[PDB]
Design a protein around this ligand. Structure first.
Ligand SMILES: NC(=O)c1ccc[n+]([C@@H]2O[C@H](COP(=O)([O-])OP(=O)(O)OC[C@H]3O[C@@H](n4cnc5c(N)ncnc54)[C@H](OP(=O)(O)O)[C@@H]3O)[C@@H](O)[C@H]2O)c1
Ligand SMILES: O=C1c2c(O)cc(O)cc2O[C@H](c2ccc(O)c(O)c2)[C@H]1O
Length: 326
């Protein structure tokens, strides 16, 4: 058969984007992978080495801060997977340097998609930080819950600008799509764990593996955390792109637990690494999982393939090669 319609993946050199490019290639797609510097071979080479990239992968230069930088890559495509997002959070002007750029970059992508005229559906990768960041945590969250931007700007917890960046970018994309009759899917992943192709530790694996290492500043994140295997997320993003009935936001979380429960699992399953018994900055006593419901996606027929055990087994190995002690 022929390639299943040219699709674009923004941020293809990244943790999520590189794997989605892989999975889209395996699924029979012609993939137009976007990067800020097609010349940085350290970042681009792992993509070109992917199975099937020689025939159906092409690399394009684009930057969310440069208007029109994406028009060429999008022209003639049937779909666009927006995965790139500004990841700088050591800013002194978070607003004009992280927030507005994130919101203006997604809207420019949406504008490019509408003007291309060939795109049938846009898949925006959101984050759980656009759902459950509020003063009083609920026991269950789904695609109808939205983070409280005002509360984020008020208390300015660690990582506040990213949550607000992504929550506004999510709302912006949805509004633009509704105003212009565009078909937009919004996929909400929690902390993503899985293999990686870069030679640098993905940030989400720093958090996921903070209990084996000693990354105590990451303990607060694991307090009440949800996970998804990177492979399941990328599969779900392809599933949602191909299902004609999909529409709107989708939660893509397959596991919810607490720091205590995770430490328990790692103790029993990895006697080799020493797991702390008391975690700095947590202490206290009663923590109950906060669940992210994926019922909308599962109802459409999607099924998760991997367990949290599968996630760490794969994260360990790809890091045991380099980046972590054995
Ligand atoms: N990993 C998780 O746990 C998780 C959970 C929920 C949602 N997400 C979302 O998944 C998506 C991918 O994130 P990630 O985990 O894979 O982190 P990542 O590896 O840092 O990927 C981010 C990508 O965005 C690109 N990027 C940054 N600024 C850009 C710009 N101005 N123009 C074009 N590209 C730019 C980066 O390319 P450069 O190499 O050139 O900087 C980078 O490849 C994000 O939208 C994230 O919010 C991730
Ligand atoms: O994007 C996300 C993210 C990320 O990209 C990088 C990183 O290092 C940690 C992260 O954690 C976020 C998160 C997970 C579970 C939640 O309950 C929540 O509110 C937020 C996640 O959404």
């Amino acid at each position: 058969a022929a390639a299943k319609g040219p699709v674009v993946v923004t941020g293809a050199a990244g943790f999520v984007g590189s794997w989605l490019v892989r999975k889209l290639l395996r699924a029979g797609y012609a993939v137009r992978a976007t990067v800020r510097d097609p010349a940085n071979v350290g970042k681009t080479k792992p993509l070109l080495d992917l199975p099937g990239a020689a025939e159906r992968l092409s690399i394009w230069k684009a930057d969310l801060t440069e208007e029109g930088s994406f028009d060429d890559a999008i022209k003639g495509c049937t779909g666009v997977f927006h995965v790139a997002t500004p990841m700088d959070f050591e800013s002194k002007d978070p607003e004009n340097e992280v927030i507005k750029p994130t919101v203006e970059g997604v809207l420019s992508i949406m504008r490019a998609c509408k003007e291309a005229g060939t795109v049938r559906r846009v898949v925006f990768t959101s984050t759980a930080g656009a759902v459950n960041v509020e003063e009083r945590q609920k026991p269950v969250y789904d695609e109808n819950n939205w983070s409280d931007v005002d509360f984020c700007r008020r208390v300015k917890m660690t990582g506040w600008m990213y949550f607000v960046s992504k929550t506004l970018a999510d709302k912006a994309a949805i509004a633009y799509a509704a105003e212009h009759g565009m078909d937009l899917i919004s996929v909400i992943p929690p902390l993503v764990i899985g293999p990686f192709i870069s030679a640098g530790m993905p940030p989400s694996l720093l958090t996921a593996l903070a209990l084996i290492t000693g990354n105590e500043p990451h303990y607060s994140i694991l307090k009440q955390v949800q996970f998804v295997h990177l492979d399941d997320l990328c599969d779900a993003e392809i599933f949602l792109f191909e299902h004609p009935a999909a529409a709107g936001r989708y939660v893509c979380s397959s596991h919810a637990t607490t720091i205590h429960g995770l430490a328990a699992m790692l103790r029993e399953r990895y006697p080799e690494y020493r797991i702390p018994e008391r975690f700095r900055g947590i202490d206290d006593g009663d923590l109950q999982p906060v669940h992210f419901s994926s019922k909308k996606l599962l109802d459409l027929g999607f099924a998760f393939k991997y367990t949290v055990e599968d996630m760490y087994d794969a994260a360990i190995r790809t890091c045991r090669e380099k980046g972590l002690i054995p």
